[PDB]
Amino acid sequence: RVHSYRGVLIITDKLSVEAGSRASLSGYISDGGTSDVFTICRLLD
Amino acid sequence: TATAENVLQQFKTQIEADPTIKDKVSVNVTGSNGSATMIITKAGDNDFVKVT
Numbered sequence: 001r002v003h004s005y006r007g008v009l010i011i012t013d014k015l016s017v018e019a020g021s022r023a024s025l026s027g028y029i030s031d032g033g034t035s036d037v038f039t040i041c042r043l044l045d
Numbered sequence: 046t047a048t049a050e051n052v053l054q055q056f057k058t059q060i061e062a063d064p065t066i067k068d069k070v071s072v073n074v075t076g077s078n079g080s081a082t083m084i085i086t087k088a089g090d091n092d093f094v095k096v097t
Contacts, residue, residue: 003082005073 049081050074056083070094 053074060072069091073084087094 001076001080001082003075003080005075005084 048078050076050078053081053083 057072057074060070061067069089071086071088074081075084076082085094085096
């Protein structure tokens, strides 16, 4: 005899994922800041 | 307990319907009337199989 058969086709894979990252920061040496009220001043003791 | 093909197909259905062992082995039937044949092989995680 000569016979044949069939089987299910099987495949394999490696899927993987990656993201990465970042960071940020901004500033400066302050002076005076900000104030709503801003007027000439006299300071007694 | 009763062609050859109609006999083997009975065994194939029995094994595939068995609650166990079916997930561990693979069965297959081919051939017509008098040239019917069966094939049994390891399947799944199971590593050992025998027929007698």
